[model samples]
Target: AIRKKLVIVGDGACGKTCLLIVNSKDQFPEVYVPTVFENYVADIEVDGKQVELALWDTAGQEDYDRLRPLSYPDTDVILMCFSIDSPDSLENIPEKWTPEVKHFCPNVPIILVGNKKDLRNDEHTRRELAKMKQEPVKPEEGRDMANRIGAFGYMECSAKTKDGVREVFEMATRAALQA
Candidate 1:
């Protein structure tokens, strides 16, 4: 088995914690407390090879910005995530998160993740974003941004439904192996 470390970053309430929790714990969290910092190690098999994937969760709130970099060292891969239901969150990727990761780990591979895919077509979600004259981020937009930002690849997932969650990490592991 190989071991790898992955650090995730994105805007606050953008589903970073939920995705990590659902993937590592195999269960969804009932409460939505803002994460300060959390660590989870997942034993997974990707492409028939064993992997010990260390998931490092960082606080997305600006209040924790200064403390967030403490989790960056030795990162083998990065998941630059955004919520599909929030257009602004996706906007923040190039504006906010990308530069920070590039500065810290210049050579690390980044996989752009569009989280909360289940909400992309939800009536309530569409209505909510529509109120602001916006709509859920389309998958194509995610792909374009990933390319624009030079992400290793792009992925979409719904932590609530466990869709694409495993694939995200499996791809991350593959990236780590290649890295």
Candidate 2:
């Protein structure tokens, strides 16, 4: 069997590249130039299944995102990373993205990631301290949205801490097999 190739994408600083560094070399970059058009292939395994991730990290800027649809012809697996603080990214994804994926790669596996999990509590601390009450964020909705997209893969992690990072790729690969 051929090694699976996975593509990871999102708006800039959503931890796409950071995740690559953290996963590949255990070195997370504090900053990185958005990749324009590049293929970073990662060779790994899932459930003893040999796989390769041809991660296509894209520039988060608008003009680039619009132009990137041209490159989807060869994609196999898609991982959509989003920041937890950026609720809008997560919200817009369910409506605008799943349809596009269905239109392009109908059978491709898509994994949704909520990056910055550690910061979730710290960020919430401010609001609680200010109002003396916690403003609850329903994370289940994000996972549900992914399921609604036929994604069936969900991973929440902190790129800064590298927690749950491996599970993201592992789950994505598993989902790819199901597809």
Candidate 3:
């Protein structure tokens, strides 16, 4: 078996923590607790190889900015994540996340992930976004950003529903292996 490190970064409450929890723990966290730094290990088989994947979860709050870099060292793959319901979080990809990841893990492969996919067409979420003259992010926009940021791939997932969750890590493992 080989080992690799995957770090996820995004705006607070953009579903980063939940994504990691759902993938590693196989259960959804019902409460929202801001993360400082957390780690999980997942054993996965990808490309016919066993992988001990180390998952590093970082806090997106500006308060943890100084400490977040500690998670980047030796990273093999990065999940540049955003919530489909929060366009501002997606906007931060280029403005905030891309620069930090590039500086810390210059050659690491990044996968742009749009989280909370279940909300993309939810009535409640749509109503709320419409109140602000906004809408959930479209798949095309996510793909566009991935191309713009030179991400290795683009994927969407919903931790609550578990849709596309496995594919996200599968792609991460593949990216890590090739990187």
Candidate 4:
């Protein structure tokens, strides 16, 4: 089996943890739990070859800024994620996430991920964002950010609904194998 390392990083509560949980566990978590540092091993086949993708989930909160880089040493690809309902989370892509990851894994390919796709059109989520004069992060915006940050690809997924979840990892695996 081929082995590769993937590290996901983004702002706290941006659905990074849920993305991994759903992809690896095939179940959506009902409650919110902040992550410190978590790891998962996903066995997947890409282009007919077995792959062992070691997923490293990092804390996005400022508290772990110093510790997060420990996951970067030998990463093959990166999932730089943000929630669709939170515009600020997207804003932080280039402002925070990209800079940090690039410094540690300078040549690793990064796939920009927009998580919480289910909430992008949810009534309650839209209403809450409207209250603050904000809106969901559109697909085009995600793509533009990917271009700005030189991401290898941009993908959106709903971990809650299992939509596009498998594709995200498959794409990551392909990117890792190429690297």
Candidate 5:
């Protein structure tokens, strides 16, 4: 089996943990537990090759800022994620996550993932962002950000519904293979 390491980073509560859990375990988490640092392994098939994927989940909180890059060494693909329901989180991708990843892993490919896609159409989610003079992040915006930041590609998914979740992993796998 081929081996690859993928690291995901983003704003706290932006659905990073759920994305990893659902993809690796086939189970969606009902309760939110803040992640400090966690690792999971996924056995996947990319084309005809068996891939042993090491998934590194990093905390998005300021508390872990000092040690988060410890997970960055030797990464194959970086999933720089953001919540579509949270515009601020999306804004941080270019402002924060991109630079961090570029500094630590300059040559690794980054797949910009817009998480919580189901909320993009949720009435309550729209109303909440509207209160802050914002709206759910549009796919076009994500595509634009991916282009602007030199991401390998852009994908959006909803962890709660498992929609587009597998595609994210598949794309990441392909990128990892090429990298």
Candidate 6:
């Protein structure tokens, strides 16, 4: 069986840790303390293949920016997650996260996940906000980002409701195998 690694990267509190917990364990409590030191990681299998979904739940501390490159060593897939309700957090994509993904793992698969889509009709507001920020984002922006970086694809999900989370993981894995 082939093994793959999915690195979940995003600023803290945008739901990286929460999403990872919920999707892997099928349960994430309402209570959570901010991750201060490092992110999270775990293992799972898909189609009988031994895959390791290593979640790099970074502290996302501004001071930790320099340490970002270290996480990319031997990385496979990248799930760049963010909230759909916040514009400022989305703006950090091209500036901070995306480039770092480019810097460390130049050709790794990336799944751009816009988490927190449970906002219902307010989804358009988030899309327009991403457009305004000059980051061509979508509920499934990961696809385009993956294309640009020669990685995988994208998917929009909500860790709060456990929406589209598993699909995103499987899609990223499938894409990685094709790559």
Which structure among the candidates has the greatest lDDT? 3
What candidate 1 gets wrong by more than 4 Å, as runs, is 32-37
| Candidate 3 Cα RMSD after full superposition onto the native fold (Å) | 1.4
* lDDT (10s digit) by residue, model 1, range 112-147: 999999998899999988889999999999999999
Over the stretch 1-179, how does candidate 6's per-residue lDDT look in tens digits? 46566677876677777777777678765876456324444455566666655566555656666576676787777888767666566667666788878887787877777777775346576566657773334554445444664545557787778888788777776655655
lDDT of each: 0.89, 0.70, 0.91, 0.90, 0.89, 0.67
- What range of 10 consecutive residues in model 4 has the weakest lDDT sum? 31-40
Candidate 2 lands at a TM-score of: 0.81
TM-score for each of the candidates: 0.95, 0.81, 0.95, 0.95, 0.95, 0.75
- Per residue, candidate 2 scores C-alpha lDDT tens digits across 1-179 of 55566667665766677777677666656666345436666666877888776666665467877776775777778888777766656766766666776787777878888887776778564475447443323479777877787776778887689898888877876776664
Pairs of colliding residues, candidate 6: 39-57, 40-57, 112-142, 142-154, 143-154
Flag regions of model 2 displaced more than 4 Å: 31-37, 124-137
lDDT tens string, model 3, 50-161? 9999988888446677778888899999999999999999999999999999999998999999999999989999999999999999999999999999999899999999
lDDT string for model 5 (1-179, tens) is 89999999999889888899999778788875547336678888878988888999888446677778898999999999999988889889989998889999998999999999999889998888888898899999999999999999999999899999999998898899993
What total of clashing residue pairs does each candidate reach?
A: 0, 1, 0, 0, 0, 5
After superposing candidate 5, which stretches have Cα over 4 Å from the reference?
Answer: 32-37
When summed lDDT is taken over every stretch of 10 residues in candidate 2, the lowest stretch is 129-138
Per-residue lDDT of model 4, residues 50-166, tens digit only: 999998988844667767878889999999999999999998999988988889989899999999899988999999999999999999999999999999999999999999999
